[model samples]
Each structure stands twice: as structure tokens, then as C-alpha cells.
Target: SAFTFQTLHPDTIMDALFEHGIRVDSGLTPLNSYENRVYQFQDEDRRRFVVKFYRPERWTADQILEEHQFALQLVNDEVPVAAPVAFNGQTLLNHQGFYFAVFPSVGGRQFEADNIDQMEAVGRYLGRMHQTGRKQLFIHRPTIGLNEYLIEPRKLFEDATLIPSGLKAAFLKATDELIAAVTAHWREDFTVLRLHGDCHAGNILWRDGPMFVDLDDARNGPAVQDLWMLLNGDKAEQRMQLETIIEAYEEFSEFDTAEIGLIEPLRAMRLVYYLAWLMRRWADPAFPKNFPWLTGEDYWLRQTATFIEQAKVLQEPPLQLTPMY
Candidate 1:
């Protein structure tokens, strides 16, 4: 079968689970995701488990361990997260860094804006995530996604390297203004907090209740960085839903104007990066046609294309776009 269940071994997984104090009792099946096929099982020790064998080579094992640890820690703090249950008493799995842990599958359906309460609930939880995450987890050195992966217009336009002519002039004009506006306050230390780094509708599971999974992208970054994945597109209803979600989040957390300014570019970078990632994932025929929370088509291009076009409008109130951590 094309499933990871066929790709990994039971005894192999069980042996590693033993190291973590988890003992499974039954066979498991894969959960939903493009990276790995996840399965839940019970061990001889009567323990529950979720095992994942990754197909992606870019992510190292150490990173997995840290992501799980951080996620589990957040769950313990009542962060509305999926709590990782150790198999064989260990959360980190094997030497291979490929591993599994049992989590209380946040059994809830992904909520939507059609229902005000659900949307608000999800939004409030997101707010709590942003508010608490800002300084909750400690990263000795953190990867700031926005500040790191975000592409600057100037860097696109001016590099003596092959700057495409059409984009070059526009990139220069937009990026120069952005640079000037950005320098005014970026270095001013406001607040640096721990972040989930990656949060979006698709990453959330709403089984028995709403629960967030996939914290592998955790890092130390700006607050709006969390919302970037969410601000989908420029359509009337789309922007309205996006605005509603943000207001819902704001109901719980606080943001100054500077943080608010980052929201737009943050959305831009997130959609760009996530779409790029999805572009690769969609190549798989085995992948699901629709994501639980939204369709890939809705997320990948609709919102992104709008941002690119709007960003081209160089004559707006100058808001410095800083692609920084």
C-alpha cells in the first residue's frame, strides 16, 4: 500500500515506544497530513499511542523531538493543545529521530465563521495562544520565520544578481519605502515571546472539541506572525472573515500599532511560504483533495495573488514592511 502503515514496522515502532514508556495493544492507521501518515494504537501495557514515520528528509530528528516537547509542555499548561502521551515513558522516540507519541486526539470538528460562536471560540483560543506564547516557551536561539523567510522587494530588485527587469523597478520603489518606514521602529525592543511560528485553519482539529496540532514550526517571533497563515484573501467576504478572526483574537490578546502593521506582510509571507510548501504536497495523488478547515485552492492562490497585486500598489500610506524576526 502507498500508506506509511506499510512503510513502517510494528515491532520497530513498539520497541521505540517501550523506551518512551508507551506500550501499544492494537494495530493503528494513518492520520491526515502531507508529511507523515499517523496511526493510533494501544500497547500490551494498555497505553494509547500515535506513531508517525516521516517521508520528508529536510526535517532532522532533533527538531522533531523539540517540537513534540514544546507542544506537550503547552498542552500541560492548558493551552488547548493536543497533549502528547509518552509511550514507554519517553516522549522522544529513537536514535533515528523518526518516532511517535500518543496524544489526546483533540477530537473536535474544525469550526467556521458561518457560526459566530465557533469562530469567536477559535479566535479567542488563538488569542490565548499568541498572548501566552509570546514569552512562555524558551528557545536558546529561535528561528524567526517572518524575518527569515520573507522576501524583501529591494533585495529582489537591486541585487547585482539577476534582478528581473519588470519586477526590478517596482521592487526597488516599494522596497525602498518599506525599508525607510521599517527602520524607524524595528529595533525598538517591545516584547519578544515564544510562538507556534505556524498556525492555520488546517493545522487545527475540532473533534470532540477544538485542538491545535502540528507545532513543529515553533519559534520565537512577532505576535502577528501567528495570524499570517490565516488572513487568506482580498475578496469582500474573505477579508471580512479574516477581519472577524483577527478581531476575535484581539478580544483576548493585545497588539500595538506596530504589531498591527506587521499583519499584512505577515499574511503575505505566510501564504507565499505555505503555498510553496503545498505546491509540493499537491504533487501527490494520494493527498486529500480538500483540507479539513479549507481547500488548498482557497488558501494557496486566492489570498496570495491578491497580496502580490495589492503590494504592487506603491502609493499607499507608507507602512514599512519589515521581514524580520
Candidate 2:
């Protein structure tokens, strides 16, 4: 079978839902997702829901199931998450060869990134989720670290043909230095707990409050993994934001102030991982269209410069842990 979602037709998707005893009334409208095929559908009684067809081969069945259970656990803790909907005591379904899960259709715009109140509330929400996360460990999901984020990806970048030959050496050198800079900051005993893993603005939805979603990237990592992605802008602004987040975060789960130092390093790792991610997904038709620039030399030119900037930031003083009133 092909790697694409072509194997599973819309009719097949609807049929799969029907077999699970769900009666779909509305059409399957494709949602914005490149990693997986997701569609919004309504039931005969006007109840809305989403069915996500997991991308083939990306995650093993066990990993996907683990993600569902993690979200269910958060739901159990009253954390606002779009947990997988169970059908006939099964959360995961196989239609033909495709693995899929149903979720309650959640509605809300992306949360405001600059809203301090929301940011602090999100911090508290994450604190509670992390508190729940600590109750147990994920056996199937992988951990986020230098090797998975940097070293392994560096090997692929070395072999990738897109970069200009002259720039390839420079890119490799800058990445190596960034990795070393990040490595030097790790204390060998950083706190590793379950994380939302890909916690960014897009993953959060706000109606009157924040709701965290998408556990597909959930994994074992430092608390900073969930915290750093929410921040951006000048150092002073970021510091203020971090203070609010950590101040509220500490209310529920104790945070290691030292993890603040890992922010820039983690950012550097994301740059590398992002490039590798785009490259790895190139075979998927959506990738080429969505990232046309990835095929060109100029993109890498800017990316190489970004790596250098991240390297500089990685060497700067860590964000202070003092709560700013």
C-alpha cells in the first residue's frame, strides 16, 4: 500500500464510523493536517466529531494507543484535552490497513500568544497536566533528547541533497557547534517527565479558557520541553512571559529553575529537527506544495543563518527564574 491516505476513501472513512455504530449525517470535511488525515463530521443527531486517520508507518500501533491513554488520563484529571472517543470499548480502529481514532470536535480559535493572563492560565493548565503525567511513565512513546533531536537528524542532513555543496559544510559545522553548546548545558540529571511534547500555539485552543490537544507528539522529556515553545520575542518580553508561566506553573508542579538554561538549546534542537521533519515528509504530496522553498538553495541559506543565530542565543545567559511582579 502507498504511504498516502489514498487507500482510505471518504466513503471508507464514513463506513468505518458506521461500523463502529456512529451515524454520520454531514460530509467529511478535511481538516488542516499534513501528518495525518483528519476530517470533521456530524452525527445524525447533529452531534459533531472528528475522525483522524493516522499516517501510515509514522507511529506504531502501541505508540498511538499510548497517546490516546495519555489524553484520557488528562481528561480524567479534568485537564481540557480532546481525548479520543471510544467506540465499543475500543479507542483505535483499523479500516482496511489504516489506523484511526475518533475525537470530539473541539471548536475555538488558536489562543492568543501575547495575552499574559492566558499564558499564565496555560502555565497552570500545563502544571496540572504534568502533575498528572508524573503519575505514570509512557512505555511506548520515545523520549526527547539530543540524540533523537540532533545527532540522528544530523546524519540525515549530511546525506540530504537539497543544500548547496559549499553551504553543506557550513551548515554541518554550525549544527555541530550548536549541539555541543546545548550538550554543555545539560546537567546529566535533568528532570524527565511526560510532556505534551509539541506544545505550541497551534496545539492550544481557547474558547473562554485554554484547551491542550494533540498528544501524537507526546513523549518523555524535561518540563522545559512543554514550556519553551510558548515563548518568543525580545529577551525582556520572553523573560516576563517565562516569569508568569513559571510562577503559575510552580503552584501545581515544582519546576526546576535550572531548566531555564535549556531553552535556547532546545530551540536549537527544534531547528534541526524541523528541517529533518520537512525533509522526511517530502514524499507526501502535501509537503512539497506546502514547503516549496525547501527545494531551493535560498531556504537553506536562511536556515544556515538561523542556526548561527540560535548558536549565539544558546551561549547567552539563561533566562532568570525570579518571578517578576
Candidate 3:
């Protein structure tokens, strides 16, 4: 029972699926995912499915099962999500002590973030999904609140080897300011619901409209946590993007205009959290190759400046919904 990522061999995957009555007619095509091992296979009936082996110990079995349950709820609610495929009264499967899940292949190209129409359509799609997400709370997955995303990650950065000695104090100071600014703005009334946890444009694919995929990051958080990642460019452009999303988003679920305060705060949390994430995964061979620029003194200096930028964004007034709603 190899617990490492490399343990899930193609033959093992094939055998596991076959044992569940899945007949593989074609070879596996590895998917573009780093956290988990996934592959595409077509059965003898010409049906295609995506097989995903859970990364060992990254999430406990119940945590993975909770994500599966969320996906099942979305699919059952008729949301166009790639929910887990069930077999033998189970959606999760065990192969040589590794957990895996199967899903019917859903095909579409990545959603275009620059296209206002596409973004608006996706906004509507997300609105619908969020409406469904509001119906329940996850008993296992963590919330994307300030403490976990900001405070803890800051601690990890301080403990991590990545921060340059000279910039460590400055980075820590800026991170604290960032945390304080976000904490002050956080309202008790902010709507928290199940989110696509990682709602970047890459997670969305468009056929006729957006087909949301990858609920791996799904957890409890502000709805804006899902929307903020879709935004890009300067403040004006982000506002325009937000308006488009809210325009359609309001059709299915109520958009809290006040939560606009969370945009940069959430972005700040992501910026800090992402560095910590990389630091944690530095032992993975691919991480070093992919993030070669991460270690230099210039990088930390630049991050210090970015943290300051996020701090400024946080101090400024939140975006106004105005007549756009």
C-alpha cells in the first residue's frame, strides 16, 4: 500500500474500474491536475469517464466523502457539475488502500474571462449553484474565513524557509496589517455558503453556458470568495466585471452588495495563502521546477510591495454596487 502520489498506477486504476463493471476500451489520458492523479478513459460502450485518485492524507476519507456529497447535491439539484459516479452504493472507491472516484466525462472549453457575456452567463450559473449551496453546510470541510486563510498562512510563511532574512520582518509586518485590515472589515452578517472553493476561470468550462467542474476546493466561505477570483485588471474593470456577474447572479440568488468589501481582502488572503501553499509543497519535485523564481531576494521584496498594495486596496472604500444592480 503505497501512500504516495506515485502509487496509483494505470493498471491499478483500470483494474479498480473493471472490478466495478467499467469496461475500458481506450487507454488513459492523464488530466492537467497537480494535487490529485486523474485520467480519462472510454469504456467499451463508448462512454467516457474521468477517474480521480485522491491524494493520500491531503484529505481524510470523510472529508473527501463530504466533497462528494456536495457534488451529489449540486448534480441532484440539476446543476451542470461533474459529480461523482456511483457504483455498488458508493461514490468513493478503494484501490489498494487509495481512495478514488469516477465521474462521467463532461466536455467543454475553458470559459473566457474577458468576454463579458460569458462572464455574465457564468455569473448566472454560479448564482444558481450558490443558491443550491445555501441549502446545506459541510460537516467536514473547513471554512475560508480569515483565521485559516490569512492568520494561519502568515504563521506558515514565518516558519517556512522561503522568506528572505532581510525581508522577513517587513513581510511579516505587512501580512499582519493585511490581516488586521481584513478582520476589521469582516461583518458578522456576511453570507457564508458552500463555494466552488477554487472558482478561478480555469475551473469553469463553457459548452452552451458554464459547466462548473472541480469541487475539490469546495468549502464554506463568502459568495464573493467564489466571484473575486473571476475578476481581473484595475479597479474600474473589476467593478464592471462585478456588475456583470451580479446582474445575472442576482437572478438566482441575492447578491450581498456589502460583501464587496471582501474582494481585496479575499485577494489579499489568496496572495498570502498561495505563497504558503507553495512553501508547503516545495518538497514536491514539480513545485521547484514550476516556481523557480520563488526563492530569490527580489521575489520576497516584490511580495512585500504586493502585500503593501493589497493593504492599500483593503483600506480603500469597498466597491459600490450603485445602479448596476
Candidate 4:
């Protein structure tokens, strides 16, 4: 039987904390997370903390620890990140057969993706994070590559009943071409280091500056994989944003202009990967309740159009950076 959260009740959560020597006084507030069960609560001492219950069977203990270690590394380097709280030299704790971790509650508003100043600040932090990221490799975690992001997703679509029959042929064809285009951009020399993996704005929290959260998706990939997602708007606007980010980024780590070409391909990869993820998670009751639109044929039609559109974007010139001088 697949692992379900039905077994993880409020009492189970409190017991897990008590076992770790943390006494909770307040009610648990569920955070917005579908992949994992996350809750925020206050300890008896009035200290706020967030507990993340790893989705069963999603990642092994070793894989989960690697992410914790990565976050700890950033915290040690003085980077603002919510590192998992260590309990008697152990970060990953097991309670009632569930693997979970606790982190000190760090609150901030959502990161502003379109704000140029915020972009520059986030870029500098990302540069520093990547600098630390390059120091070691995660042996157990999966790499962001074609198989996981593109090919596997394509296979999922092939078998997915959610894709309407009328759009299946067109969707598959668009996906095939998009995958091919993305593959063509894939280079042999781009440096792959441990990355935040999902650097989208939602993972970032803004206080005075960027406070990165969630290393759960951390993996080995090109540095651009950590960057391209922060970009928004049209070609001109995106170019300016990229330039601003790179300028601040280069202060901490070197920027490889060649990686810029991979941006669109990476976007295409994410587009397919997300659809595959939705289909894979459809069995989870939460997905259907939250993403009710996934069942509609119009959604599949729009996805096909997006795939075709992104493939065409691949044929266009990649974003070029203006001279910083």
C-alpha cells in the first residue's frame, strides 16, 4: 500500500515533537505544501518552529539528510536559510514510521519576482549559495536531467488518461518536438553543481533581503537551473533582469553566458515535468481537490498549445546580456 498521511494525525505530530524533546503548546497550522506535510507551531517556550513530514517513499533517509546538510552548509556560511534543527546530532528523525524534520520558524513575505532590486539581491544570495553548492556533490540525490524532467514526463503523458483523446496526438507531437529542441540545447560542458533545484520565487522569502527556504528539491544541475526561473516578462525585460542578476551574481561567482541559451529549454522541460507531476500526484486526494481544472479537456488543449509555443521559442535567439561596462 502507498504511504498515506491518514496515519499522521495531530497526536502523531505532537508525539514526534515530544520524542525530540520539543513540547508544543499551540495548535498546528498546516502550510501550503502538497508534496509533503508541513506544519507550523509554537513550543511551550513560545518559540515558533515548522515541522516538515517527508512524503512517504518520496526520498530515502540519505537523500533527505543530504538536503538538510546542504541547508546547514548555507546557514554556516551566513546565508539566510531555514536549516533543519538538529536533535541530539540527528536532523532526520523517525516517529511512528514517518521521517520528519523541524526548523526554526523564519517568517517573511513571498519574494517579488518582477522587482528588479529584489532580483539583484536574490541573485547575489544565489551566487553565494551556488558557491557553497560547488563544494560538494550529493551522492544519493537525483540529478536534474533529460530522463527525469523530459523523457520520463513524456512517457507519463503517453499513459495518462487525463489527456483528452482529442488532444492526445497533438499533445504528444508537441511534447516530442519540445523535448527534441531542449535536447539540442543540452551541452556537454555546462557546469553541474548542487542547486536549490527549484529556485522559483515561491521558495524565496523576503524580509530585508532574500531568505531562501526549502532545499527539498536541491539537486545537481547547471547553475542556470537555479537562475532562469526567477526571470519574468518579455524578451527585452527578461534580458535586463538577467543582466542585473548576473552583475550582482558575478560578485560572488562567475557567470557563464553560454548557460543563458539553456533558459528556454529549461522552461520547456519544467512545463512538461509539471504536467507529469500533476498526473503522477492525481491519485493523491489533495491534488484533485486543489487542481480540479486538471480534469478538463480545455486544460489539456492549453497545455498542447503551450508545448508548441515553447518549442517555437527554442528556435528563436536565446537572451543576450548587454556589456556591464
The best candidate in terms of lDDT? 4
If the candidates were sorted by their lDDT against the true structure, best first, what order would they fall in?
4, 2, 3, 1
Please report the TM-score between candidate 4 and the true structure. 0.93
lDDT of each: 0.56, 0.85, 0.83, 0.87
Q: Write the per-residue lDDT of candidate 3 for residues 183-229, one digit (tens) a residue.
A: 88776688789999999888888898788888888989899888988
What's the distance in Å from true for residue 182, model 2? Answer: 1.9
Best by TM-score: 4
lDDT of 4 by residue, 1-325 (tens): 2234454787888889898887778798888888888999997788888999998877999999899999999888878788898889889999987899999999979889888999999999899999999998899999888999899888878877888886899889988999999999877678888899999888899988999888888999899998998888998998899989999999888989999888888888888898877787676789889999998888888988998888788785554664455
Model 4: residue 47 alpha-carbon error in angstroms: 1.6
The clash number for model 4 is: 0
TM-score for each predicted model, relative to the true structure: 0.64, 0.92, 0.90, 0.93
Where does the lowest 10-residue lDDT sum fall in candidate 3?
1-10
TM-score of candidate 3 to 2 decimals: 0.90
Expressed as tens digits, the lDDT of each residue in 241-296 for candidate 1 is 66676677887687553665665555445544443344345435544455432242
Off by over 4 Å in 3: 1-7, 316-325
Q: Per-residue lDDT tens digits of candidate 2, residues 1-325?
A: 1234355678888878877787788789888987788999888788888999998878889999888988998999889899998887879988887889989998888799899999999999999989988888788888878888888788888888866888899888888887888878755588788899999998999999999878889999889899999997898999899988999998889999888877777888888988888787777878888899897788888888888787777664566685577
Q: Which stretch of 10 consecutive residues in model 2 shows the poorest summed lDDT?
A: 1-10
Candidate 1, number of clashes: 29
Residue 31 displacement (Å), model 3: 1.4
